[PDB]
């Protein structure tokens with residue numbers, strides 16, 4: 001009875017497609033799932049989502065071209081987006097255009113942008129939560145930071161990590177330039193550079209490809225430090241990508257429960273049903289699929305929170321206001337429920353921590369959160 005247009009901006013072929021492919025699959029699964037099950041406004045009008053998928057391959061020029069297409073050709077009222085650089089670049093424009101923007105980027109810089117949302121803590125709060133886990137579990141010690149200095153995503157929480165680090169009992173010993181498109185040689189060079197400083201802990205801010213190469217290299221060159229990665233740097237593939245050398249010594253952050261730890265989680269079972277209905281094999285359902293699915297689901301919950309009159313008249317603005325006026329639960333997938341403040345869209349703070357176990361199998365550590373007094377988010381926002 002009502003159809004809305006929604007953009008889906010993904011990286012299926014570029015330098016972040018290691019994690020981007022799964023996200024795209026999960027987002028599409030969610031669109032098809034909720035469309036078929038039935039999406040209803042508060043006054044009971046059915047909503048159909050016509051989604052327009054565009055693989056921009058992490059290319060910032062292409063991102064802006066597809067944005068203009070979404071807006072001008074399709075008149076979308078919402079976009080399910082991707083990269084930190086492009087999401088940040090577009091944030092002021094999406095406010096002007098009144099398009100609700102839900103991103104795979106969890107940049108803290110988005111928190112003050114009125115139309116940007118994501119169902120996770122920002123990257124900095126996530127990072128500081130993971131580092132607090134390290135400090136409390138293994139003690140105070142030396143910390144090296146490995147990230148691509150040229151990539152907005154790789155840089156995002158670095159400033160906040162440096163500011164928060166002393167209060168966490170962590171001494172930052174250096175920054176190390178690991179490319180987003182790191183080769184094995186790049187990873188070994190960085191591991192050998194860090195070895196000279198002998199850190200107890202290593203942070204990596206890149207996607208799973210370079211994070212895993214680094215973990216593997218660290219073990220190969222004899223740097224026996226723990227590796228902690230951001231959410232996009234670690235998943236179900238990590239045991240195989242890092243190898244036996246990293247067993248017992250690598251940790252991943254995730255705001256979302258993995259399917260393998262979520263047999264009894266409603267939202268995980270919702271994804272599994274979506275998979276069955278769309279001919280997707282169960283073994284293709286992973287964390288990346290969850291990350292895509294939950295972004296679409298957050299949009300669905302917003303639509304279910306508005307009247308059809310509101311949706312028709314104010315479009316993306318009706319969706320923004322609904323996201324600000326309600327607490328959301330996505331079938332218990334997220335580490336905490338979702339609640340957004342006008343002017344500060346911080347969904348929640350805590351995260352799950354996952355260990356690459358001694359036996360090579362992934363192990364859930366539990367939920368962890370940075371100290372209450374550490375304003376990780378605002379540290380990053382105030383940068384510059």
Ligand SMILES: [Mg+2]
Pocket residue numbers: 323324325326327339340341342
């Ligand atoms: Mg709220």
